[PDB]
């Protein structure tokens, strides 16, 4: 990986983290009791 | 034991040497006794390091196991020599839990011991069994 | 002592070579005059000849009189003076 190539990966990782943050309450609801 | 000495000395021999020196001086009491006591204190195990004691223990083990006077390197004697160190290393670890480098070192040492006993078993099984029995394994 | 061998360089040269020429006579005279005037009040006749000398110096121009080949040698002798191993 060059830095430029890495930056796409970084961006992807950030997006994933954001998604996880968004779907925290939903995830909690899904997890407990089933 | 109470009158055991470090630095590869023996108490009986030391006293004899001192007496011989005295005789030589005469040829050519309380103070002399005090000097002798001072010497003993200097050369005692209990004032010396643990390292000297370990060395002595290793020597004793070698003497016990050697299949002839010269033997150092007999698979059995090697194992015996390893054991003393392991015991001491184990004791050290028991004092010092988080000393991870020295736990690793201990581990390596027992792996080495295992390996040499495995070898002994292949070479000379009865002898290996005897060695094991002696060591308490 | 600790010797320090450089790596292979593109070109051994001093960035700026100083000539180290002598300081100007007129400037020196002016400094001397200034020093004299620090003592002895403003303009006493102890520095009567000094002022005249300064004037003589700085008549045609403010300064009286108006390069070291070191790079050429370094450039010349770099390839020799290297301890660069053979080709």
């Amino acid at each position: 990986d060059s830095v430029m190539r890495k930056r796409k990966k970084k961006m992807k990782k950030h997006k994933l983290r954001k998604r996880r943050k968004r779907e925290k309450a939903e995830r909690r609801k899904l997890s407990q009791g089933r | 034991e109470p009158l055991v000495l470090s630095k590869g000395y023996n108490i009986e021999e030391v006293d004899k040497f001192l007496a011989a020196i005295e005789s030589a001086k005469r040829e050519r009491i309380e103070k002399l006794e005090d000097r002798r006591e001072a010497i003993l204190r200097i050369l005692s195990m209990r004032n010396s390091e643990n390292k000297n004691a370990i060395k002595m223990a290793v020597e004793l083990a070698r003497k016990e196991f050697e299949r002839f006077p010269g033997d150092t390197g007999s698979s059995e004697v090697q194992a015996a020599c390893m054991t003393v160190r392991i015991q001491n290393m184990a004791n050290h670890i028991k004092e010092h839990r988080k000393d991870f480098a020295n736990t690793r070192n201990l581990r390596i040492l027992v792996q080495q011991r295992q390996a040499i006993l495995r070898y002994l078993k292949r070479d000379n099984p009865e002898k290996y069994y005897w060695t094991i029995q002696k060591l308490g394994l | 002592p600790p010797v320090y061998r450089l790596p292979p360089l593109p070109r051994l040269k001093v960035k700026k070579p100083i000539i180290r020429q002598e300081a100007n006579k007129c400037l020196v005279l002016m400094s001397n005059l200034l020093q004299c005037w620090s003592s002895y009040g403003h303009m006493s006749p102890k520095c009567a000849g000094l002022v005249t000398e300064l004037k003589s110096c700085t008549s045609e121009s403010a300064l009286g009189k108006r390069k070291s080949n070191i790079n050429y040698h370094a450039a010349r002798l770099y390839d020799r003076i290297n301890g660069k191993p053979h080709d």
Partner: protein
């Protein structure tokens, strides 16, 4: 008390640090210059400047290495130029 009196500020001279000099009345400027030189030798202003901010330990180590390299290069250059000068002098 008598003993204290006898000890005429003997400790005061040796107790103080090396950042101190007795002024000659003929030239205070010279004394100041000497002090400045001493400070430079001890690297005290440069140390003070370094201490204004924090620099991550790996970063400061890298900087230190770079400085060392630069130093070693400069004395390697000096060595080279001295040789060049000698060659010039001789005829080479």
């Amino acid at each position: 008390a008598e003993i204290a009196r006898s000890s005429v500020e003997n400790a005061q001279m040796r107790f103080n640090s090396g950042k101190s000099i007795i002024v000659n009345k003929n030239n205070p400027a010279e004394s100041f210059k000497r002090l400045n030189r001493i400070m430079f030798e001890n690297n005290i202003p440069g140390d003070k400047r370094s201490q204004r901010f924090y620099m991550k330990p790996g970063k400061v180590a890298e900087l230190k290495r770079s400085q060392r390299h630069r130093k070693e290069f400069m004395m390697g250059f000096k060595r080279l130029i001295e040789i060049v000068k000698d060659a010039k002098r001789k005829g080479y």
